[PDB]
Structure 1
Amino acid sequence: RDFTFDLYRALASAAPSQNIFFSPVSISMSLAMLSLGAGSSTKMQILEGLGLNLQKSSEKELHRGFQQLLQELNQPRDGFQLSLGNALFTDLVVDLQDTFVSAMKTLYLADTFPTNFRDSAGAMKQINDYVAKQTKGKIVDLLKNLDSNAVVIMVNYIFFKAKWETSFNHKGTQEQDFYVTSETVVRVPMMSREDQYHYLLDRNLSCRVVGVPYQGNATALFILPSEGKMQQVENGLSEKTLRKWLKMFKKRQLELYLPKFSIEGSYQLEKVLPSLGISNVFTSHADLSGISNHSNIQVSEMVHKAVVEVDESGTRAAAATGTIFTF
């Protein structure tokens, strides 16, 4: 089980030849928080879906790791911007378990806000405005046509903005053909810069890997499969593969041509996660006794929205995951 890449493949398979874009950490963090109030088989599926084994120590480490990450981000980044946060919007009628609220505040630094879900329009405005603010206007209207039977919405957001360590020169950007397929061509602004880059020719998966650094410790990795090998590369993606690429990188001089682009992803994860074995939490048989003792509580949907902008100066990326609970 490989969470990030099994999820990637599920999304890719659900929408062939389409752009794909999401934040693995936003979703994993959301699932980890969800597990705090899950029980029995419902919790089991979530932990196994995240790639954990049956050891209690692994569960403790899961939360400890995320708590450490959130605390680390409370310190100013060096050279760029990276924000990650959580919030619970709960209706006054809802009675959350003391332990769940405490765990959310302590482990996930979650914000807690009262919400009148009977006022669907008002609830959407409150939550969407919050998400937009936290993502500096990049994630707008996360929630659309809200159920109205909603009682709690758990939100995770992530915002990233960084300048390339070395920018592309605007005078080096020219219109070029982009081959979606050998027969489908689209015109795109193609940026370019000759420089030394971390590079690797992966003969196993058949792709070229290039690392492009951001100011700070973050980096972008661009993967170009050989002709006709995108499916092969997608099938081979894994945590191990990524580790291999990052450690085997070698410095090489390249005249790099990369398109200036902006793409996004909008998903109803409740329809996708069952592919990773996470299904009970979305049913009437969900065991969410840890979040509320109220009967018939389940997750109606888990919406994810992610966007990215890549240009000559750098990259801006953001995402949010809204987990909606109903009675």
Structure 2
Amino acid sequence: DFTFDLYRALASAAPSQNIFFSPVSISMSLAMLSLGAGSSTKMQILEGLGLNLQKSSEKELHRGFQQLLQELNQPRDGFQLSLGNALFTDLVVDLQDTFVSAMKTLYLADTFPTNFRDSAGAMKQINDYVAKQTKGKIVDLLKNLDSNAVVIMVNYIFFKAKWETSFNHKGTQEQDFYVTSETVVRVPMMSREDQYHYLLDRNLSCRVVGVPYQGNATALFILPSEGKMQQVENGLSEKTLRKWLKMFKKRQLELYLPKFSIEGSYQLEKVLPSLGISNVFTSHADLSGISNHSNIQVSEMVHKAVVEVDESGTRAAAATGTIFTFRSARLNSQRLVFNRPFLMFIVDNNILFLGKVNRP
């Protein structure tokens, strides 16, 4: 698995830490990059994306993403999704019009000649570019920039959508969240009893619940059994996802989910090589589709994903202006409380987001 092996790579590199990235967005930038890559550099990228038998249609691959981008970029109401890619290339590097054209046309991405000789100027231009493309949601992508950089590739994505059903601000109270058995933090816990797509996975030992967004996206929160986080991570795979997308049944639940913001920032040139994509970062890189200039390669491939989660939804919890019972108070339903590290997916027909919430 491209996506899940990448998740494990990132996880292994930063134990006991939050992880968060966009799979679709990463595949998108790699395909886009293959547009100017040649020989073994290109082939490593395509196989990494996993590319059909007969090494068939790359243009079909670009068609898919091309359409996907369009659908993703079409506004709704209270749906905030900013995603994009850009290539910053040194002044020496003469660009190929066929590359620049394909990038803008197919992926809506830009290629900007840049003066990396002025490290501090380039960093600010890049950060300002992203701050604007994100309507201010991602303001300081790069934290440092080398003077010898030749080409910087940045991929960014910010997402915030209204729940299909809201969380009553009256159900939010501070509560303990156990990062570990001995590390505890107070967090504002939202709550709402309702019918949710539930799933008990005895194989991996974890509970999965689905919460739909006011649109076409649905959040999946995975709660491992006490001490089973590593096991679950070891079990993550596209197959498993398919499996889960079937076991899903409606179940009355009193859900307790934290209000939180989560982000991941990565230098993919330090992890992708372990997944088989290495030539593109070396001096032996083949980016002849991009320029005829020798000695060029991707100096840095940064990726930043940001997502905010809160009460806001489309409609308020309609009800029990029907609560019938002789009891003083109705009894509780099954309770699912995320007050220990959990995993989270945000999926449409693809996987927009994948991460591990260790500390809200």
Q: Same fold (TM over 0.5)?
A: yes
Per-residue CA deviations over 1:121-168 (Å, capped at 9, x if unaligned) read: 222222211111222222121122212233433333333221111111
Structure 1's unaligned 5+ residue stretches are none
1:32 maps to what in 2?
31
8 Å CA contact retained: 2:38, 2:289: yes
- Which whole-Å CA distance do the structure 2 matches of 1:12 and 1:262 have between them? 19
Please tell me whether Structure 1 or Structure 2 has the larger radius of gyration of its CA atoms: 2
Count of residues paired in the alignment: 325
Q: CA 1:316 to 1:260, structure 2 compared with 1: closer, same or farther past 3 Å?
A: farther
> Which moves more between the two structures, 202-211 or 64-73?
64-73
- Which whole-Å CA distance do the structure 2 matches of 1:171 and 1:211 have between them? 22
8 Å CA contact retained: 1:95, 1:294: yes
- Which whole-Å CA distance do the structure 2 matches of 1:238 and 1:83 have between them? 27
SS of the aligned residue for 2:34 comes to helix
Structure 2's unaligned 5+ residue stretches are 326-360
Per-residue CA deviations over 1:166-194 (Å, capped at 9, x if unaligned) read: 11111111222212222322222211111
Q: CA 1:177 to 1:132, structure 2 compared with 1: closer, same or farther past 3 Å?
A: same
Q: CA 1:74 to 1:263, structure 2 compared with 1: closer, same or farther past 3 Å?
A: closer
- Which whole-Å CA distance do the structure 1 matches of 2:6 and 2:186 have between them? 30
What's the offset of the Cα at 1:78? 6.4
SS of the aligned residue for 2:170 comes to helix
- Which whole-Å CA distance do the structure 1 matches of 2:225 and 2:154 have between them? 39
SS of the aligned residue for 2:57 comes to helix
SS of the aligned residue for 1:240 comes to helix
- Which whole-Å CA distance do the structure 2 matches of 1:193 and 1:88 have between them? 44
Per-residue CA deviations over 1:76-108 (Å, capped at 9, x if unaligned) read: 346623343333334443211232222212211
8 Å CA contact retained: 2:40, 2:279: yes
SS of the aligned residue for 1:170 comes to coil
8 Å CA contact retained: 1:159, 1:317: no
Q: CA 1:113 to 1:282, structure 2 compared with 1: closer, same or farther past 3 Å?
A: closer
Q: CA 1:246 to 1:22, structure 2 compared with 1: closer, same or farther past 3 Å?
A: same
8 Å CA contact retained: 1:309, 1:316: no
Q: CA 1:76 to 1:175, structure 2 compared with 1: closer, same or farther past 3 Å?
A: closer
What's the offset of the Cα at 1:246? 2.4
What's the offset of the Cα at 1:267? 1.4
Q: CA 1:325 to 1:62, structure 2 compared with 1: closer, same or farther past 3 Å?
A: farther
8 Å CA contact retained: 2:89, 2:150: yes
- Which whole-Å CA distance do the structure 2 matches of 1:154 and 1:29 have between them? 12
Taking structure 2 as the reference length, the TM-score comes to 0.81
Q: CA 1:262 to 1:75, structure 2 compared with 1: closer, same or farther past 3 Å?
A: closer
- Which whole-Å CA distance do the structure 2 matches of 1:201 and 1:72 have between them? 33
- Which whole-Å CA distance do the structure 1 matches of 2:259 and 2:176 have between them? 13
- Which whole-Å CA distance do the structure 2 matches of 1:75 and 1:321 have between them? 36
1:324 maps to what in 2?
323
> Could you tell me the percent identity over the aligned residues?
100
